[PDB]
Amino acid sequence: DKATIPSESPFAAAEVADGAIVVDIAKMKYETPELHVKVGDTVTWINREAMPHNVHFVAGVLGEAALKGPMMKKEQAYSLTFTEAGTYDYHCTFHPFMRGKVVVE
Ligand SMILES: [Cu+]
Ligand code: NA
């Protein structure tokens, strides 16, 4: 697969790492919908609002099957570590019109 998962479950936003690369979720949008990172970087999404959200990569994008992230409540976080260059689109399972991408250089 093209990413690894440091926290299977959502975790508290207060425990986001050291200078972490963060994508905030608010107002039904990923706030940084075109994020550029490098191979080896970890991206952390943080839901800033009451409406639950997740991140969802369709089958084939990060592995043979879809990567459906866990439901994230307000001030919950979820991370993925990208190990291969490429562009990886995602959406919110609950709200598929909400889209973003990670561009890994
Ligand atoms: Cu959503
Ligand atoms: Na912002």
Side-chain angles (χ1 to χ4, degrees), residues 23-51:
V23 180
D24 291 311
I25 320 172
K27 300 201 185 232
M28 308 295 294
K29 295 180 191 358
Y30 301 107
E31 291 185 35
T32 310
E34 185 178 327
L35 178 71
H36 288 252
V37 307
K38 286 206 200 158
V39 167
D41 284 338
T42 298
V43 178
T44 300
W45 289 266
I46 306 179
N47 187 5
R48 299 297 189 180
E49 64 181 3
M51 174 61 77

PDB file of all heavy atoms in Angstrom, residues 23-51:
ATOM      1  N   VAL A  23      -4.480  19.406   7.975  1.00  0.00           N
ATOM      2  CA  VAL A  23      -5.614  19.821   7.141  1.00  0.00           C
ATOM      3  C   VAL A  23      -6.836  19.949   8.050  1.00  0.00           C
ATOM      4  O   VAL A  23      -7.328  18.942   8.602  1.00  0.00           O
ATOM      5  CB  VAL A  23      -5.895  18.868   5.986  1.00  0.00           C
ATOM      6  CG1 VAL A  23      -7.080  19.354   5.179  1.00  0.00           C
ATOM      7  CG2 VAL A  23      -4.674  18.698   5.099  1.00  0.00           C
ATOM      8  N   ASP A  24      -7.306  21.164   8.256  1.00  0.00           N
ATOM      9  CA  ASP A  24      -8.486  21.407   9.050  1.00  0.00           C
ATOM     10  C   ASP A  24      -9.746  21.146   8.197  1.00  0.00           C
ATOM     11  O   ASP A  24      -9.726  21.358   6.988  1.00  0.00           O
ATOM     12  CB  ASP A  24      -8.500  22.849   9.596  1.00  0.00           C
ATOM     13  CG  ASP A  24      -7.416  23.047  10.635  1.00  0.00           C
ATOM     14  OD1 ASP A  24      -7.253  22.279  11.563  1.00  0.00           O
ATOM     15  OD2 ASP A  24      -6.668  24.058  10.502  1.00  0.00           O
ATOM     16  N   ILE A  25     -10.815  20.711   8.873  1.00  0.00           N
ATOM     17  CA  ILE A  25     -12.126  20.489   8.269  1.00  0.00           C
ATOM     18  C   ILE A  25     -13.132  21.389   8.941  1.00  0.00           C
ATOM     19  O   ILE A  25     -13.297  21.334  10.167  1.00  0.00           O
ATOM     20  CB  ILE A  25     -12.561  19.035   8.325  1.00  0.00           C
ATOM     21  CG1 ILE A  25     -11.447  18.044   8.042  1.00  0.00           C
ATOM     22  CG2 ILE A  25     -13.729  18.813   7.340  1.00  0.00           C
ATOM     23  CD1 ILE A  25     -11.839  16.593   8.279  1.00  0.00           C
ATOM     24  N   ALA A  26     -13.785  22.275   8.174  1.00  0.00           N
ATOM     25  CA  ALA A  26     -14.765  23.187   8.745  1.00  0.00           C
ATOM     26  C   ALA A  26     -15.679  23.666   7.644  1.00  0.00           C
ATOM     27  O   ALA A  26     -15.246  23.737   6.471  1.00  0.00           O
ATOM     28  CB  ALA A  26     -14.115  24.385   9.435  1.00  0.00           C
ATOM     29  N   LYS A  27     -16.916  24.021   7.974  1.00  0.00           N
ATOM     30  CA  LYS A  27     -17.877  24.557   6.989  1.00  0.00           C
ATOM     31  C   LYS A  27     -18.004  23.640   5.798  1.00  0.00           C
ATOM     32  O   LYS A  27     -18.078  24.085   4.660  1.00  0.00           O
ATOM     33  CB  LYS A  27     -17.591  25.999   6.641  1.00  0.00           C
ATOM     34  CG  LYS A  27     -17.669  26.863   7.896  1.00  0.00           C
ATOM     35  CD  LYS A  27     -17.896  28.322   7.856  1.00  0.00           C
ATOM     36  CE  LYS A  27     -17.778  28.832   9.283  1.00  0.00           C
ATOM     37  NZ  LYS A  27     -18.953  29.655   9.695  1.00  0.00           N
ATOM     38  N   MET A  28     -18.024  22.342   6.054  1.00  0.00           N
ATOM     39  CA  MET A  28     -18.261  21.364   5.014  1.00  0.00           C
ATOM     40  C   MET A  28     -17.159  21.390   3.941  1.00  0.00           C
ATOM     41  O   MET A  28     -17.424  21.049   2.774  1.00  0.00           O
ATOM     42  CB  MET A  28     -19.659  21.467   4.391  1.00  0.00           C
ATOM     43  CG  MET A  28     -20.798  21.466   5.432  1.00  0.00           C
ATOM     44  SD  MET A  28     -20.960  19.976   6.339  1.00  0.00           S
ATOM     45  CE  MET A  28     -21.437  18.860   5.094  1.00  0.00           C
ATOM     46  N   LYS A  29     -15.932  21.720   4.297  1.00  0.00           N
ATOM     47  CA  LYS A  29     -14.816  21.762   3.373  1.00  0.00           C
ATOM     48  C   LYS A  29     -13.544  21.296   4.090  1.00  0.00           C
ATOM     49  O   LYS A  29     -13.310  21.565   5.274  1.00  0.00           O
ATOM     50  CB  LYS A  29     -14.546  23.198   2.837  1.00  0.00           C
ATOM     51  CG  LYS A  29     -15.714  23.707   2.004  1.00  0.00           C
ATOM     52  CD  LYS A  29     -15.430  25.121   1.472  1.00  0.00           C
ATOM     53  CE  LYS A  29     -16.642  25.757   0.871  1.00  0.00           C
ATOM     54  NZ  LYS A  29     -17.885  24.957   0.831  1.00  0.00           N
ATOM     55  N   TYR A  30     -12.684  20.657   3.297  1.00  0.00           N
ATOM     56  CA  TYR A  30     -11.285  20.498   3.684  1.00  0.00           C
ATOM     57  C   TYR A  30     -10.608  21.846   3.427  1.00  0.00           C
ATOM     58  O   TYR A  30     -10.656  22.350   2.292  1.00  0.00           O
ATOM     59  CB  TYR A  30     -10.615  19.403   2.890  1.00  0.00           C
ATOM     60  CG  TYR A  30     -11.270  18.061   3.033  1.00  0.00           C
ATOM     61  CD1 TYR A  30     -12.027  17.486   2.036  1.00  0.00           C
ATOM     62  CD2 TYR A  30     -11.136  17.332   4.227  1.00  0.00           C
ATOM     63  CE1 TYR A  30     -12.601  16.246   2.174  1.00  0.00           C
ATOM     64  CE2 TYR A  30     -11.732  16.109   4.389  1.00  0.00           C
ATOM     65  CZ  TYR A  30     -12.473  15.543   3.370  1.00  0.00           C
ATOM     66  OH  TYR A  30     -13.039  14.299   3.408  1.00  0.00           O
ATOM     67  N   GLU A  31      -9.983  22.458   4.427  1.00  0.00           N
ATOM     68  CA  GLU A  31      -9.539  23.854   4.310  1.00  0.00           C
ATOM     69  C   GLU A  31      -8.310  23.970   3.404  1.00  0.00           C
ATOM     70  O   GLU A  31      -8.089  25.043   2.860  1.00  0.00           O
ATOM     71  CB  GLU A  31      -9.364  24.473   5.652  1.00  0.00           C
ATOM     72  CG  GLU A  31     -10.679  24.666   6.370  1.00  0.00           C
ATOM     73  CD  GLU A  31     -10.498  25.406   7.682  1.00  0.00           C
ATOM     74  OE1 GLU A  31      -9.660  26.297   7.811  1.00  0.00           O
ATOM     75  OE2 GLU A  31     -11.112  24.937   8.641  1.00  0.00           O
ATOM     76  N   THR A  32      -7.507  22.919   3.300  1.00  0.00           N
ATOM     77  CA  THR A  32      -6.352  22.871   2.384  1.00  0.00           C
ATOM     78  C   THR A  32      -6.601  21.751   1.405  1.00  0.00           C
ATOM     79  O   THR A  32      -6.073  20.629   1.572  1.00  0.00           O
ATOM     80  CB  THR A  32      -5.048  22.664   3.123  1.00  0.00           C
ATOM     81  OG1 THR A  32      -4.927  23.583   4.193  1.00  0.00           O
ATOM     82  CG2 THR A  32      -3.879  22.851   2.156  1.00  0.00           C
ATOM     83  N   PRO A  33      -7.461  21.985   0.395  1.00  0.00           N
ATOM     84  CA  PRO A  33      -7.881  20.882  -0.482  1.00  0.00           C
ATOM     85  C   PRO A  33      -6.858  20.462  -1.531  1.00  0.00           C
ATOM     86  O   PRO A  33      -7.090  19.447  -2.170  1.00  0.00           O
ATOM     87  CB  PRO A  33      -9.140  21.397  -1.113  1.00  0.00           C
ATOM     88  CG  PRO A  33      -8.903  22.853  -1.179  1.00  0.00           C
ATOM     89  CD  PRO A  33      -8.187  23.227   0.113  1.00  0.00           C
ATOM     90  N   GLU A  34      -5.788  21.187  -1.688  1.00  0.00           N
ATOM     91  CA  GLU A  34      -4.690  20.743  -2.523  1.00  0.00           C
ATOM     92  C   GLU A  34      -3.389  20.879  -1.737  1.00  0.00           C
ATOM     93  O   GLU A  34      -2.758  21.933  -1.686  1.00  0.00           O
ATOM     94  CB  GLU A  34      -4.592  21.474  -3.830  1.00  0.00           C
ATOM     95  CG  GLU A  34      -3.485  20.821  -4.662  1.00  0.00           C
ATOM     96  CD  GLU A  34      -3.309  21.431  -6.025  1.00  0.00           C
ATOM     97  OE1 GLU A  34      -4.291  21.874  -6.625  1.00  0.00           O
ATOM     98  OE2 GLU A  34      -2.127  21.499  -6.414  1.00  0.00           O
ATOM     99  N   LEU A  35      -3.022  19.818  -1.030  1.00  0.00           N
ATOM    100  CA  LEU A  35      -1.916  19.856  -0.090  1.00  0.00           C
ATOM    101  C   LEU A  35      -0.695  19.237  -0.747  1.00  0.00           C
ATOM    102  O   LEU A  35      -0.776  18.105  -1.246  1.00  0.00           O
ATOM    103  CB  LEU A  35      -2.292  19.049   1.167  1.00  0.00           C
ATOM    104  CG  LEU A  35      -1.174  18.968   2.226  1.00  0.00           C
ATOM    105  CD1 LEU A  35      -0.991  20.292   2.892  1.00  0.00           C
ATOM    106  CD2 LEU A  35      -1.537  17.889   3.223  1.00  0.00           C
ATOM    107  N   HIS A  36       0.424  19.950  -0.742  1.00  0.00           N
ATOM    108  CA  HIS A  36       1.683  19.430  -1.274  1.00  0.00           C
ATOM    109  C   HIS A  36       2.587  19.007  -0.103  1.00  0.00           C
ATOM    110  O   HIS A  36       2.888  19.779   0.769  1.00  0.00           O
ATOM    111  CB  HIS A  36       2.362  20.492  -2.092  1.00  0.00           C
ATOM    112  CG  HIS A  36       1.628  20.718  -3.425  1.00  0.00           C
ATOM    113  ND1 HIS A  36       2.050  20.344  -4.683  1.00  0.00           N
ATOM    114  CD2 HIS A  36       0.421  21.242  -3.629  1.00  0.00           C
ATOM    115  CE1 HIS A  36       1.145  20.684  -5.586  1.00  0.00           C
ATOM    116  NE2 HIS A  36       0.113  21.252  -4.995  1.00  0.00           N
ATOM    117  N   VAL A  37       3.013  17.760  -0.140  1.00  0.00           N
ATOM    118  CA  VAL A  37       3.946  17.165   0.843  1.00  0.00           C
ATOM    119  C   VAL A  37       5.036  16.430   0.088  1.00  0.00           C
ATOM    120  O   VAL A  37       5.016  16.332  -1.134  1.00  0.00           O
ATOM    121  CB  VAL A  37       3.209  16.236   1.829  1.00  0.00           C
ATOM    122  CG1 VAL A  37       2.047  16.996   2.455  1.00  0.00           C
ATOM    123  CG2 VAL A  37       2.738  14.925   1.226  1.00  0.00           C
ATOM    124  N   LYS A  38       5.982  15.860   0.827  1.00  0.00           N
ATOM    125  CA  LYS A  38       7.072  15.062   0.282  1.00  0.00           C
ATOM    126  C   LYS A  38       6.887  13.616   0.752  1.00  0.00           C
ATOM    127  O   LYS A  38       6.263  13.299   1.768  1.00  0.00           O
ATOM    128  CB  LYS A  38       8.431  15.596   0.695  1.00  0.00           C
ATOM    129  CG  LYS A  38       8.712  16.903  -0.115  1.00  0.00           C
ATOM    130  CD  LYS A  38      10.201  17.060  -0.212  1.00  0.00           C
ATOM    131  CE  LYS A  38      10.545  18.500  -0.536  1.00  0.00           C
ATOM    132  NZ  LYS A  38      11.975  18.713  -0.094  1.00  0.00           N
ATOM    133  N   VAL A  39       7.527  12.723  -0.021  1.00  0.00           N
ATOM    134  CA  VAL A  39       7.558  11.302   0.342  1.00  0.00           C
ATOM    135  C   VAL A  39       8.085  11.184   1.774  1.00  0.00           C
ATOM    136  O   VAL A  39       9.158  11.755   2.110  1.00  0.00           O
ATOM    137  CB  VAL A  39       8.449  10.517  -0.630  1.00  0.00           C
ATOM    138  CG1 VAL A  39       8.769   9.128  -0.142  1.00  0.00           C
ATOM    139  CG2 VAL A  39       7.854  10.460  -2.023  1.00  0.00           C
ATOM    140  N   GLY A  40       7.359  10.435   2.577  1.00  0.00           N
ATOM    141  CA  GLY A  40       7.629  10.187   3.951  1.00  0.00           C
ATOM    142  C   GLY A  40       6.859  11.031   4.955  1.00  0.00           C
ATOM    143  O   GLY A  40       6.857  10.743   6.143  1.00  0.00           O
ATOM    144  N   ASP A  41       6.191  12.097   4.488  1.00  0.00           N
ATOM    145  CA  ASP A  41       5.453  12.975   5.359  1.00  0.00           C
ATOM    146  C   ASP A  41       4.147  12.336   5.853  1.00  0.00           C
ATOM    147  O   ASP A  41       3.485  11.573   5.177  1.00  0.00           O
ATOM    148  CB  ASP A  41       5.128  14.287   4.656  1.00  0.00           C
ATOM    149  CG  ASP A  41       6.300  15.237   4.542  1.00  0.00           C
ATOM    150  OD1 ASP A  41       7.282  15.133   5.329  1.00  0.00           O
ATOM    151  OD2 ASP A  41       6.311  16.132   3.683  1.00  0.00           O
ATOM    152  N   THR A  42       3.780  12.750   7.095  1.00  0.00           N
ATOM    153  CA  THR A  42       2.495  12.418   7.685  1.00  0.00           C
ATOM    154  C   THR A  42       1.565  13.621   7.613  1.00  0.00           C
ATOM    155  O   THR A  42       1.941  14.735   7.974  1.00  0.00           O
ATOM    156  CB  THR A  42       2.681  11.994   9.165  1.00  0.00           C
ATOM    157  OG1 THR A  42       3.499  10.809   9.219  1.00  0.00           O
ATOM    158  CG2 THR A  42       1.362  11.682   9.828  1.00  0.00           C
ATOM    159  N   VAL A  43       0.369  13.370   7.122  1.00  0.00           N
ATOM    160  CA  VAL A  43      -0.719  14.365   7.059  1.00  0.00           C
ATOM    161  C   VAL A  43      -1.702  14.011   8.146  1.00  0.00           C
ATOM    162  O   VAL A  43      -2.085  12.863   8.311  1.00  0.00           O
ATOM    163  CB  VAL A  43      -1.407  14.345   5.695  1.00  0.00           C
ATOM    164  CG1 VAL A  43      -2.575  15.347   5.645  1.00  0.00           C
ATOM    165  CG2 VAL A  43      -0.409  14.592   4.570  1.00  0.00           C
ATOM    166  N   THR A  44      -2.167  15.054   8.886  1.00  0.00           N
ATOM    167  CA  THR A  44      -3.169  14.881   9.915  1.00  0.00           C
ATOM    168  C   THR A  44      -4.362  15.770   9.592  1.00  0.00           C
ATOM    169  O   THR A  44      -4.214  16.993   9.492  1.00  0.00           O
ATOM    170  CB  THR A  44      -2.614  15.188  11.310  1.00  0.00           C
ATOM    171  OG1 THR A  44      -1.518  14.306  11.605  1.00  0.00           O
ATOM    172  CG2 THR A  44      -3.656  15.004  12.386  1.00  0.00           C
ATOM    173  N   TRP A  45      -5.531  15.166   9.463  1.00  0.00           N
ATOM    174  CA  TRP A  45      -6.783  15.898   9.334  1.00  0.00           C
ATOM    175  C   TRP A  45      -7.365  16.097  10.725  1.00  0.00           C
ATOM    176  O   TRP A  45      -7.290  15.193  11.565  1.00  0.00           O
ATOM    177  CB  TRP A  45      -7.775  15.071   8.464  1.00  0.00           C
ATOM    178  CG  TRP A  45      -7.392  15.029   7.019  1.00  0.00           C
ATOM    179  CD1 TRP A  45      -7.856  15.883   6.049  1.00  0.00           C
ATOM    180  CD2 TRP A  45      -6.510  14.135   6.378  1.00  0.00           C
ATOM    181  NE1 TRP A  45      -7.287  15.564   4.841  1.00  0.00           N
ATOM    182  CE2 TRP A  45      -6.462  14.488   5.022  1.00  0.00           C
ATOM    183  CE3 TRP A  45      -5.710  13.040   6.796  1.00  0.00           C
ATOM    184  CZ2 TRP A  45      -5.673  13.799   4.091  1.00  0.00           C
ATOM    185  CZ3 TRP A  45      -4.953  12.373   5.881  1.00  0.00           C
ATOM    186  CH2 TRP A  45      -4.931  12.756   4.528  1.00  0.00           C
ATOM    187  N   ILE A  46      -7.919  17.271  10.953  1.00  0.00           N
ATOM    188  CA  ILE A  46      -8.577  17.589  12.232  1.00  0.00           C
ATOM    189  C   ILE A  46      -9.943  18.163  11.919  1.00  0.00           C
ATOM    190  O   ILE A  46     -10.065  19.174  11.218  1.00  0.00           O
ATOM    191  CB  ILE A  46      -7.775  18.579  13.086  1.00  0.00           C
ATOM    192  CG1 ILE A  46      -6.338  18.087  13.291  1.00  0.00           C
ATOM    193  CG2 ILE A  46      -8.499  18.787  14.381  1.00  0.00           C
ATOM    194  CD1 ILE A  46      -5.475  19.033  14.108  1.00  0.00           C
ATOM    195  N   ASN A  47     -10.985  17.524  12.433  1.00  0.00           N
ATOM    196  CA  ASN A  47     -12.338  18.053  12.284  1.00  0.00           C
ATOM    197  C   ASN A  47     -12.525  19.170  13.283  1.00  0.00           C
ATOM    198  O   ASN A  47     -12.398  18.953  14.505  1.00  0.00           O
ATOM    199  CB  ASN A  47     -13.385  16.970  12.489  1.00  0.00           C
ATOM    200  CG  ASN A  47     -14.780  17.453  12.179  1.00  0.00           C
ATOM    201  OD1 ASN A  47     -14.930  18.602  11.712  1.00  0.00           O
ATOM    202  ND2 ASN A  47     -15.765  16.607  12.317  1.00  0.00           N
ATOM    203  N   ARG A  48     -12.827  20.389  12.808  1.00  0.00           N
ATOM    204  CA  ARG A  48     -13.023  21.544  13.675  1.00  0.00           C
ATOM    205  C   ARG A  48     -14.450  21.838  13.957  1.00  0.00           C
ATOM    206  O   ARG A  48     -14.711  22.808  14.687  1.00  0.00           O
ATOM    207  CB  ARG A  48     -12.300  22.739  13.081  1.00  0.00           C
ATOM    208  CG  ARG A  48     -10.840  22.571  12.937  1.00  0.00           C
ATOM    209  CD  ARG A  48     -10.093  22.397  14.228  1.00  0.00           C
ATOM    210  NE  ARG A  48      -8.659  22.466  13.898  1.00  0.00           N
ATOM    211  CZ  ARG A  48      -7.705  22.362  14.777  1.00  0.00           C
ATOM    212  NH1 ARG A  48      -8.013  22.137  16.039  1.00  0.00           N
ATOM    213  NH2 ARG A  48      -6.430  22.483  14.353  1.00  0.00           N
ATOM    214  N   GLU A  49     -15.389  21.071  13.470  1.00  0.00           N
ATOM    215  CA  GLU A  49     -16.823  21.396  13.631  1.00  0.00           C
ATOM    216  C   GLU A  49     -17.593  20.170  14.120  1.00  0.00           C
ATOM    217  O   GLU A  49     -17.117  19.054  14.152  1.00  0.00           O
ATOM    218  CB  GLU A  49     -17.436  21.946  12.360  1.00  0.00           C
ATOM    219  CG  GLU A  49     -17.469  20.991  11.173  1.00  0.00           C
ATOM    220  CD  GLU A  49     -18.076  21.611   9.925  1.00  0.00           C
ATOM    221  OE1 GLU A  49     -18.420  22.814  10.008  1.00  0.00           O
ATOM    222  OE2 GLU A  49     -18.111  21.022   8.828  1.00  0.00           O
ATOM    223  N   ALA A  50     -18.819  20.471  14.532  1.00  0.00           N
ATOM    224  CA  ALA A  50     -19.698  19.444  15.123  1.00  0.00           C
ATOM    225  C   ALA A  50     -20.088  18.373  14.113  1.00  0.00           C
ATOM    226  O   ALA A  50     -20.221  17.187  14.469  1.00  0.00           O
ATOM    227  CB  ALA A  50     -20.939  20.071  15.741  1.00  0.00           C
ATOM    228  N   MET A  51     -20.383  18.737  12.861  1.00  0.00           N
ATOM    229  CA  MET A  51     -20.758  17.775  11.858  1.00  0.00           C
ATOM    230  C   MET A  51     -19.649  16.733  11.699  1.00  0.00           C
ATOM    231  O   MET A  51     -18.499  17.154  11.464  1.00  0.00           O
ATOM    232  CB  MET A  51     -20.928  18.465  10.493  1.00  0.00           C
ATOM    233  CG  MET A  51     -21.178  17.506   9.330  1.00  0.00           C
ATOM    234  SD  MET A  51     -22.678  16.512   9.494  1.00  0.00           S
ATOM    235  CE  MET A  51     -23.956  17.677   9.064  1.00  0.00           C
TER     236      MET A  51
END
